[PDB]
């Protein structure tokens, strides 16, 4: 219990525990110019 | 060697453009150099609740930061925060022959409140909303052609946006707001509140029926303003009632800030729209009434402008006026009475012109009827500006003259009416 018991942490730094920001990586060269065909990630993942 | 601003007293905010960076790269993100036949991007993330603006004022006490954000919350709803969720991201590819070279910058987004006042900025304050980026694409600079030195060009914003000027007005937050709660029929009489206790304060109301409309206070007195609401009466509508959006930009359509100058509004007003009136601080604890009384006559030829009533045209010789000059193609009337009894065969020898403002002028022959004002024509397309030419008009008669300012060259319009015999 005094291993799981960790201390509460605190939210994003702009505050909330709510939810990240997300972000864009990555393209497909080329016909069809894949731009907006990537890959989205959450962007802090760890903000907490 | 600046330009005139024709703009009413109030608060005002401008959109100065986009795309707007410090000097000395201090907002550069920075270079990227991409191989031929290989791709490069530069992507700029932000965070939540986070994104620092750049802000300046003249008057930190008035024109603090949160009442710069009040404002431009007002006239765009714009927010910081908003700019907070936002991701930009340019992609350049480089060719199969030479290398390519992409530079990123993070730009803004150029807002700036003025607390306009006779002519003058009185308070002036300057925002910078982080905007999306601005991105500029070159050749590969090859190593190394040379080095050539440079000074840094001081401090400064560099726009990469293009031009941009939106002024829009806002509504004086420490002004209350009295609501009409009944749409505006052919006559009303507002009484002014003893709740507000003579400081000034704008009156929020409808119309039934579109058309031009007569307002004025008791005698004339004070001066009144009118504004239209931007974007209002698209949303939430009941019939002969009045719909508050809690707009607060408002367009500036006519009305005098001199609060002693005798004046009524005549302006053409929509039953889709809302429309404020300004009351400005009145000295004194004497009761006045707002009067509203739709036009079906010939007053309809004044809209829409404030007509300036003259009181001490009762000699021969110089008088001259100085009102606030209206923008260009904005209307500005003077009602007038030659001094002297009436007896229809008395003339006197009227010089009518202006100052410093070129304006057309059309003036009126009034003579009131059991069906209300009539308004004649007596001549058309009078060139005020240092005008020579008079005209003979009949003593103890009551004109109208509308000018229309074809060009602006001072804040101020004066109206000169000489009189000879």
Redesign the interface.
């Known amino acids: 219990l005094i291993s799981t018991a960790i201390p509460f942490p605190y939210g ?5 525990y709510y939810a ?6 990555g ?1 497909a ?1 080329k016909k069809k110019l894949n ?1 907006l065909i990537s890959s989205t990630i959450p ?2 993942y760890a903000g907490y | 060697t600046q330009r005139v601003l024709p703009y009413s007293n109030g608060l005002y905010v401008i959109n100065k453009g986009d795309g707007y960076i410090r000097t000395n790269d201090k907002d550069l993100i920075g270079t990227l150099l991409i191989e031929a036949g290989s ?1 490069g ?1 530069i ?1 700029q ?6 994104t620092r603006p750049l802000f300046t004022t003249s008057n930190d006490t008035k024109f603090s930061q949160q009442y710069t954000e009040e404002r431009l919350k007002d006239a765009f709803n714009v927010q910081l925060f908003n700019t ?2 936002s ?1 930009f ?1 340019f ?1 350049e ?1 480089a060719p199969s022959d030479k290398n390519i070279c992409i530079k990123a910058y993070n730009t803004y987004e150029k807002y700036e409140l003025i607390d306009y006042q006779n002519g003058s900025i009185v308070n002036k304050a300057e925002y910078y909303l982080p905007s999306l980026g601005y991105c500029e694409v070159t050749n590969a600079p090859s190593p190394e052609s040379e080095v050539v030195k440079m000074q840094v060009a001081e401090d400064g914003f560099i726009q990469n946006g293009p031009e941009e000027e939106i002024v829009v007005g806002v509504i004086d937050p420490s002004e209350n707001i009295q609501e009409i709660n009944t749409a505006i029929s052919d006559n009303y009489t507002y009484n002014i509140p003893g709740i507000v206790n003579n400081n000034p304060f704008y009156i929020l109301f409808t119309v039934n029926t579109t058309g031009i409309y007569k307002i004025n206070a008791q005698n004339n007195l004070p001066s009144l303003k009118i504004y239209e609401a931007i974007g209002s009466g698209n949303r939430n509508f009941q019939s002969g009632n009045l719909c508050d959006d809690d707009i607060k930009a408002i367009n500036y359509i006519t009305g005098f800030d001199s609060p002693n100058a005798k004046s009524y509004l005549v302006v053409l007003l929509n039953k889709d729209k809302n429309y404020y009136i300004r009351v400005p601080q009145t000295s004194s604890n004497i009761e006045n009434q707002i009067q509203f009384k739709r036009e079906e006559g010939d007053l309809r030829n004044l809209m829409n402008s404030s007509v300036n009533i003259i009181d001490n045209l009762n000699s021969t010789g110089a008088h001259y006026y100085t009102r606030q000059s209206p923008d260009v193609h904005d209307y500005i009337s003077y009602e007038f009475t030659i001094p002297g009894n009436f007896n229809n065969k008395d003339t006197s020898n009227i010089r009518l012109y202006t100052s410093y403002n070129q304006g057309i002028g059309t003036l009126f022959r009034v003579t009131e009827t059991i069906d209300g004002y009539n308004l004649i024509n007596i001549q058309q397309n009078l060139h005020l500006l240092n005008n020579t030419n008079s005209i003979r008009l009949l003593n103890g008669a009551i004109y109208i003259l509308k000018v229309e300012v074809t060009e602006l060259n001072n804040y101020n319009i004066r109206l000169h009416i000489d009189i000879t015999n």
Request: hydrophobic share 30%; net charge positive.
């Open positions: 994003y730094i702009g505050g909330g990240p920001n997300m972000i864009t990586f393209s060269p731009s962007f802090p | 791709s991007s992507i993330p932000r965070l939540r609740n986070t907070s969720t991701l991201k992609v590819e």
